[PDB]
Structure formats: structure tokens, C-alpha cells
């Protein structure tokens with residue numbers, strides 16, 4: 001689904 | 009002397 | 017709203033191509049993907065910038081670092097920082113930029129397929145873009161829920177707590193007792209289902225149009241995931257445009273032959289497009305209302 | 306003045322090394338090279354940012370693009386834009402940042418050899434750094450001269466013209482008739498002789514110390530020449546430190562084994578250094594006066 005809001 | 013104030 | 021070019025270098029020709037592609041494919045629509053860049057001219061203070069007063073109240077309230085204001089664990093240990101930023105950034109405190117209205121114009125010309133925004137100021141909606149056409153991937157203040165049981169809360173209950181001097185005694189869930197927060201997506205949290213569900217149907221919509229499609233990416237440094245995945249996930253045969261001050265993300269990683277890069281401010285970009293499109297007429301109207 | 310880290314990542318250890326190097330070489334001095342980054346927390350509006358009101362008055366006055374306000378040919382064809390920016394950015398309208406005072410502390414601890422600034426706000430001087438130790442490579446408003454014959458003018462004559470509503474009828478030389486402007490160096494113009502003359506004696510000073518020297522580069526994107534040449538012209542055997550949000554210039558082009566890069570805000574950097582140095586005592590004093 002895209003994972004969790006993050007960086008990289 | 010470094011030339012004139014510029015970019016690059 | 018007044019704008020100006022970002023360098024002496026003209027970008028009208030590059031922008032001209034965009035209008036050219038739209039004239040060639042009249043029955044086509046555009047997919048926008050935007051970020052914080054399109055709202056800077058609106059006066060929204062950057063919490064990561066030592067120039068804004070917002071940054072300093074945060075620093076004073078002992079916030080360890082900027083992005084922690086959008087951190088679940090920190091919010092629960094101390095919500096005052098977030099509440100303070102909410103007070104300063106709440107929707108309605110600012111007005112839409114010229115670029116925001118450009119989206120509205122496109123909706124009027126029926127050439128807008130969707131606008132994926134990672135901003136939380138909700139200026140697209142506030143500028144008239146219809147709900148159906150908007151994807152606020154990082155949420156908004158329009159909704160509120162308990163971070164513990166998920167019960168729903170009217171957005172007003174949170175907002176009324178923002179005017180008190182000082183801000184104290186926060187909104188606790190009256191079911192489980194945990195903190196209630198705005199439907200803003202925090203780091204470590206997932207995005208709403210509609211982000212992937214809409215991207216899914218929009219990914220197929222694009223592959224099936226290849227009236228050629230046109231996806232315009234504006235004002236984002238593409239540094240936050242999963243939002244930043246949409247660009248590389250664009251059909252290789254669909255033209256990609258980038259309106260940013262720097263070439264970033266996938267446009268810098270794996271540039272595509274057909275890529276069009278326009279180093280310009282989002283408001284100056286809007287001024288040029290509406291010129292090469294010949295829509296100054298309907299534009300001026302919108303802007304004066 | 307309150308600050309905070311720029312990421313969750315701690316930079317105290319890296320800053321610790323800086324203090325370590327200073328403790329090892331007690332009889333040594335430091336050479337600073339700074340830019341616009343060290344003055345952002347002071348509230349100075351960026352004329353290149355659509356967020357500042359300065360930018361918009363410029364856009365309205367029909368300035369073709371930001372940097373043109375510092376263009377000789379444009380100034381002569383229409384000086385109102387520059388005069389408008391002068392009114393908003395004139396020295397005295399702002400106060401020194403914590404980093405600025407750090408320079409003062411170093412001058413008090415006799416560990417300051419020189420500070421090369423490309424900023425024109427003159428906050429180093431305003432914060433107490435002595436004239437002898439300052440190199441304002443892009444000039445200042447402290448002096449004024451005719452762009453045609455070079456006659457000297459008291460800085461006041463230009464300043465008195467800034468309060469008139471509206472601003473009109475500019476300062477013309479009463480010898481040759483050309484426009485008189487502040488001693489600010491414009492693109493296309495050369496820097497004052499003291500920039501190279503001082504760098505010359507400072508380049509030899511460094512090579513001859515190899516009480517080891519320490520050159521700290523802060524808050525500059527190193528994108529303007531000839532200022533941006535000083536770093537690569539640093540003795541290869543002299544340790545270089547960089548305090549910026551991004552690794553830029555020669556630090557990105559030809560990194561040196563001994564380079565120390567600290568991704569931190571200039572004010573948070575100052576907070577840490579004064580801690581690892583143990584000078585909080587004299588610091589607090591300066592800050593409270």
C-alpha cells in the first residue's frame with residue numbers, strides 16, 4: 001500500500 | 009583577483 | 017499574487033510545449049501531483065525555518081526537532097507543540113495562490129482528472145476544486161478521531177481548543193480516554209485507503225489512454241514516501257512534466273527521454289501556462305471573485 | 306533566539322571534535338566564512354522567496370527576476386526596485402542572531418582571526434565584531450558612491466530618501482549627474498581590494514601555521530564567485546569544517562579526508578559549540594546585554 005509516512 | 013561577482 | 021521569473025532565463029518556450037501538447041490532445045485530462053512549493057506564496061510559515069515565529073515557539077516549547085510535531089509518540093507525550101502549530105496553520109487563516117486557482121480553471125475547462133496533494137492546508141478545496149477530484153494524501157483538519165479507539169469527532173471540538181490562552185487541557189476521547197487529533201497523517205502512520213485506491217484506478221486510466229494523458233508534478237521535493245513513489249510509477253509512455261526550482265526525485269534519478277523540466281515558481285508557471293493556453297479571459301474572472 | 310536540532314540525528318559528537326581540536330591547539334585562531342544561512346533566524350526576508358512581502362512589491366514594480374535588483378544595468382534603467390529593497394533591508398531594522406554573537410565570543414577569547422561574510426546586513430559588526438576582523442566581500446550600506454565618477458557620499462543622503470512616500474527623485478551625483486548607490490557590490494561588479502588583499506595575507510598565515518588553524522564555513526551555498534573560491538583555496542593540510550543544511554560547493558565536489566561536515570542550523574550549532582567549549586558563562590552574559 002506504500003508503507004507508512006516516511007523518508008527513503 | 010577573482011573576476012566580477014557572478015555564478016559559476 | 018504578482019510574480020516574476022526565477023532567473024533571467026525564459027521558460028515560456030518550455031511552457032509553450034505543454035500548451036501545445038494540450039491543443040494536440042483536446043479530449044485529454046491532466047493529473048497534478050503537488051507539494052509545499054505551491055503554497056509558499058500564500059504566506060504559510062515553514063515550521064522547519066528559523067525565520068518563522070512558528071519555528072521559535074516550537075523551539076521554546078522544547079520540541080526536539082521540526083518533524084517531531086508530526087510524530088505519534090511525541091504528540092502523546094506532549095501535544096502542546098502540535099496544538100500550537102495547528103493554531104497557526106489552521107485552514108482559513110490563508111488564501112489560495114494563483115497556481116491553486118489554475119487547478120480551478122482546469123476543472124472548469126474539464127481538463128482536470130485529479131490533483132494529488134501532500135499539503136495539509138487544503139487550499140485546493142478552498143479554491144473550489146471539487147472533492148471528487150482531490151486526494152489529500154496526508155489528511156486534513158476537516159476530520160478528527162481518537163488515536164486509541166478511532167471514534168469520530170466533529171472538527172470543531174479540536175478547533176475551539178485553539179483560541180484559549182494559554183492552550184491547555186486537550187481533547188481526550190470520552191470512550192477510551194486517549195488523545196483526539198485531526199485527520200492529519202503523521203510519520204509512522206499510514207495514508208488513507210483512498211490514496212492507493214484512487215492511484216490504482218488512475219494508474220489503469222493512464223495505461224489505457226496510451227487524447228494523450230499529461231501528468232504535471234509541481235512544488236514537491238519528492239522526499240516523503242509513499243507519496244514520492246507515484247512519479248516512477250507513471251506509465252513510461254506517458255509524458256511527465258516537472259515544475260520545481262530544483263530537479264528532484266525520480267526526475268534526477270532516472271530521467272526519461274520525454275521528460276520536460278521547468279525551473280520556475282509555481283505562480284509564474286501558472287501565469288505562463290494560462291497565456292500559452294489563451295485562457296486569460298476565464299482566468300482573470302476567477303481571480304477577481 | 307531559541308533553536309532546535311534539524312533532524313533527530315544528534316550532531317553533538319561532531320561538534321565535540323571541533324572543541325577538541327581547539328583544546329589541543331589553544332594558541333590557534335579560527336577563520337569563518339559565512340553566508341545568508343546565519344541570518345535567516347533574524348527575520349531578514351528573502352527577496353527570492355514568494356513568501357516575503359518584499360518579493361511581491363518587487364514583482365509588482367515589474368522587476369524581471371530577483372537578482373536583477375543587484376544588476377548595474379537594471380538599476381540605471383529603473384532604481385525604484387533596489388530603493389524598495391533597501392528600505393526593507395536597511396541595517397538596524399534587525400537584531401543579531403545567536404551565531405552572530407558566537408563570533409563576538411570568539412573575539413573576546415582571542416580565537417578569532419577573521420570572518421569573511423558575503424551577507425550585506427552587517428550583523429557581525431552590529432554584534433560587536435571589530436572592523437579589523439571583518440571582510441564584507443559584497444560591501445554594505447555604510448558607504449555610498451557615484452556609479453559614474455566615484456565621488457563619495459555620506460550614507461545618510463541615500464537613507465533619508467527611503468522614508469518618503471512614495472519613493473521618487475533619487476540621489477543623483479552633483480558632479481557628473483549619474484545615480485549614487487550604496488557600497489553594495491552588484492553582479493558584474495568587482496569586490497573591494499581588501500577582499501583579495503586580506504585573503505592573500507590570510508592564505509600565507511594559514512600555510513605558515515602548519516597551534517593548528519581551523520577554518521569554519523557556515524550558512525552559504527557557495528554559489529557566488531569569487532567568494533566561493535576561498536574553500537578550495539584552503540591549505541590542503543588545514544582542517545575544514547562545514548555547518549550547512551546541505552553539503553555544498555567544494556565539500557561536495559572534492560571532499561578532503563579531514564573534512565568535518567555538520568548538517569545543523571547555525572544557531573543550534575552555536576549552542577552546541579559553546580557547550581563543548583564550556584563558555585556558557587561568558588556567552589550568557591553577552592546574550593543578555
Ligand SMILES: Nc1ncnc2c1ncn2[C@@H]1O[C@H](COP(=O)(O)OP(=O)(O)OC[C@H]2NC[C@H](O)[C@@H]2O)[C@@H](O)[C@H]1O
Nearest residue numbers: 051052053056235236237238259260261262280281282
Ligand atoms: N514557489 C515555488 N514554485 C516551485 N517550486 C518551489 C517553490 N518554493 C519551493 N519550491 C520547491 O518545492 C520543493 C518543496 O519541498 P518541501 O518543503 O520539502 O516540501 P514537500 O512538499 O515536498 O514536503 C513536505 C515536507 N514538509 C514537512 C515535512 O518536513 C516534509 O519533508 C523544493 O524541492 C523546492 O525546490
Ligand SMILES: Nc1ncnc2c1ncn2[C@@H]1O[C@H](COP(=O)(O)OP(=O)(O)OC[C@H]2NC[C@H](O)[C@@H]2O)[C@@H](O)[C@H]1O
Nearest residue numbers: 340341342345524525526527548549550551569570571
Ligand atoms: N539556519 C541555517 N543554518 C545553516 N545553514 C542554513 C540555514 N538556513 C539556510 N542554510 C543553508 O545556507 C545556504 C544559504 O544559501 P543562499 O540563500 O543562496 O545564500 P548565500 O549566502 O550563499 O548567497 C546569496 C545569494 N543571495 C542573493 C544572491 O541571490 C545569491 O545567490 C543554503 O545552501 C542552505 O542549505
Ligand SMILES: [Zn+2]
Nearest residue numbers: 162165189192
Ligand atoms: Zn477512544
Ligand SMILES: [Zn+2]
Nearest residue numbers: 451454478481
Ligand atoms: Zn559623479
